[PDB]
Amino acid sequence: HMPQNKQSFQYRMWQFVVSPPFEYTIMAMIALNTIVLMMKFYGASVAYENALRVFNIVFTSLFSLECVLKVMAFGILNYFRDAWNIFDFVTVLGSITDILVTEFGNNFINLSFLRLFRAARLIKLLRQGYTIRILLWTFVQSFKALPYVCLLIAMLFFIYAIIGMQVFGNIGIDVEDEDSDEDEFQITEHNNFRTFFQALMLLFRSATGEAWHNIMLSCLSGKPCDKNSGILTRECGNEFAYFYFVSFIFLCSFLMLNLFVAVIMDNFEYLTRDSSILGPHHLDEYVR
Amino acid sequence: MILATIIANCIVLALEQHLPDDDKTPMSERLDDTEPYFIGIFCFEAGIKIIALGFSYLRNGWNVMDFVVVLTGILATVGTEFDLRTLRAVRVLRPLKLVSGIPSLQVVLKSIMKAMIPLLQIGLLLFFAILIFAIIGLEFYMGKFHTTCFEEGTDDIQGESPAPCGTEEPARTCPNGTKCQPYWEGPNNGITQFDNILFAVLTVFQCITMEGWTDLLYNSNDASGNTWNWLYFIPLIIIGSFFMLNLVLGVLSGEFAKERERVENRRAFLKLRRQQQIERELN
Amino acid sequence: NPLRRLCHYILNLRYFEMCILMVIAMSSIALAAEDPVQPNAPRNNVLRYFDYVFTGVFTFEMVIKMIDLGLVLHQGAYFRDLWNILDFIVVSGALVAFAFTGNSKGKDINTIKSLRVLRVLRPLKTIKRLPKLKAVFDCVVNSLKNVFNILIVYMLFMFIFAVVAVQLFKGKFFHCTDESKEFEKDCRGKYLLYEKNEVKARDREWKKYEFHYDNVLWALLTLFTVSTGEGWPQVLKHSVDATFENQGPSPGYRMEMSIFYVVYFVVF
Amino acid sequence: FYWTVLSLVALNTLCVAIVHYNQPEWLSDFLYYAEFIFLGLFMSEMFIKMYGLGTRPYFHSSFNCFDCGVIIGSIFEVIWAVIKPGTSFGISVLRALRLLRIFKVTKYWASLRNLVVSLLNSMKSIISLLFLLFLFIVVFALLGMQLFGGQFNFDEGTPPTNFDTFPAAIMTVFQILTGEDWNEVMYDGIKSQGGVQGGMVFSIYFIVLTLFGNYTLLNVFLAIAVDNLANAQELTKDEQ
């Protein structure tokens, strides 16, 4: 900011916010808030939960004081020009609204989403780390620099989802086979092909490799149809499941491998950097 | 002779059967008789070496591992103090004395450990990813897996297999004659849950390794509903399992690239090039 | 040919290259909106009317290229570049499917159902139209071309392991639902299960294990399942509990067979 | 002559591929003799090369030695069938590796040969890393026997992946390293020590095992793969 105008009060205020006591105070304040979030456990006494809710109010109050303190010294315009300050401003708004809706209560309980903003305070530690911040930023920027490589993998899931929807859609899951047939069919109400999203989830589960072979066996021929399928015989499922799942496993692995190498070789300079030789990292320290 | 003694000790350790309760195979006594001889010969080796070095004994790292083995072995062997069963567990580290004996393996172990030092920064980043997801999971899935189908008014589980249940339509609903009840042991005998922060960390960790994360998701769907549970597990796998795998391969690839261009490695490759040229010319 | 110049004016024009690119997008979305369960669902009927429009756009785009470019008469031709054959397959399958639906809807569901699966190739037509996506696609093919030499060695080694596995576990993967009856002739009648707080009677069945080693094809599939990591501990347990051909399992009969899977994991 | 021998191997490779569970009797009768004739012909080319080039030239070549091993290995299997009827290992399928010389006529020979040359050159190292990996598996096996050795006799039976005996301990440790059902094994370890109430401190052993084992395997086998392949590339280019 450096206004050199109001040395009486503004500069005294400004020198305080950019001062070693301030940054470590905020650093310690997050860490204490980190401990508070981890102190929740099941079966606690009503006093213990009362203690935790009180601590949360104190922290967010101090962080709101932190925000209003900074905006005075830096200025309203300068405060919003830095992403981290915007991130701090977003979190404090979420924390205030979450408390306000809770203490009023007596309404819809849908907004447990706002409680995530309490955990978002953890990300502020990453500003302190010199090596970790660089490592994440370079790789994240690489995914930005390569948008179309992710599009190819999305097409692989899109094509295989539609095929599974049509070939294996009508397999019956409604029947509960109690000591008859096989209830152990891996095509249940949670792992079905009945809709596009559920087809995608089954593909993702197979991608991570979670008993996909049993899913392949469950999709073979001779399985019961559905009541609304329009077929009243045990003639649902195809022998195409052998090619469907085996080809998907190989193709999914290959495409992710190319994605991994593409990101690695986008930053292969960073990964092979030498401290003795000048690089952009030292150049950034020069500007600082 | 010392190396042969280590190999014999490894064989003796490998020829042991552990029986439940207090049962002992007849060969156990014969196996145990050998321990005094081995601990004595190791102590003799250590003493003869330390008197010569003058205690540069503890200066070398490998000698320290050999030294602490001898102290623990002689501490429990002499007398039957308390339980001291834990002092038997240190005998597990005796196979590692082969590395100390053979200098050709110490060089190899240096190469493996040198490359993992860059991975330490990744591990710190990986730990901070687990902690964030553990905290989020602790807030949303806290104690939700202690509710199954009990008989109406009777504290007995409806069937031999209890399952999570809910009191509302989006979650799984108990049959007509049964009601959801406040307490149940939980899936996987209570081991898989979000109750403490330690349980949450352990539960998140196995999802990072992509093992048994579908069952946790399907259990969560039954307990609460399938509308929002995917937003917690699918990002967990992608950020946790796939992203860190991307970083680990990248960091290791960079380290291998720098390793190959060290002066020592270049000369070894240059010798291989010249030998093959001679073979081609001789052919 | 004056008439050919008319189509080339349409083809070269930007408003015909960009416009179809949305038609690809809408048609792909319409594919993902179909109800798989119920063919007579109201959603499927409406979406079918859309498929008529999408075929019309693709048919219009197919023909004008046929007038524009000779079919096989030039170095650059319609049937010269694979993407045009890929385009040809999608539209031709739809036209054939429409013709057969008409004669009797009820009588031949299977083909009707079969060629309708070919509509999933509509997303793949985006690769040619987007220059940036083709570069990524060419990168993948380049990576495939580079690892082709190692790949051939890979199947040759896995083929050898498949043959060896066949000669060791051929016919030894038969089990009886009642473990007491080792041979097939004994496995007939009723047998008792003693589970907690009940006694029930079920049939005896002579069954083959789900994943087995009977021919080179079954061995390769089982070894692929082992390599990917899923379910290989159970295949290991069936391998170590195999006695003889056409005979039931006996626990712990061959613990030396664990060496086969250990060597397999170190290699592939 | 060189192509004819390769053609015979393809037919020999085909014959062992045909074998299946329930083969027609004529097919089985055909194969039983057919292995004998193929063994004779590949023993026939053994002698003609033995005399044409000489005994000393024969042993110097590595490919001749490899063919000698397959022939001797095939001899062992034939006699073993009479001695202990019931099992056959099909050692003759290892001769299919001779189809890899087809790459000689192609332009891929230089890249593949240098990969083999680099691997054989750095044989002392590759053995050392595998041995170091073996010792780490052995140590985690002996540690498992101390902690969980005697407490998997549950009321539902002893699990196959127990730490009772040493051979059982190795397989359980090996399975955890590959990561398949490492959580189910950990559940047994926790239940063996009082369950969730009193045995959650033993979960550390599986956490350390899978965390180090997963990345140690990556750091050992990728280092072998990257270094030896990289030597092949530069050595190939310098030849060009």
Binding site: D183, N214 | - | - | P159, D188
Partner: peptide, 26 residues
């Protein structure tokens, strides 16, 4: 080889078909 619907433990691998299910039964 435990029958279908009998209580099972996954580490056993004794289940006749498939594996030990989520609910703990074959």
């Amino acid at each position: 080889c435990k029958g279908k619907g009998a209580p099972c433990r996954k580490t056993m691998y004794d289940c006749c078909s498939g594996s030990c299910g989520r609910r703990g039964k074959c």
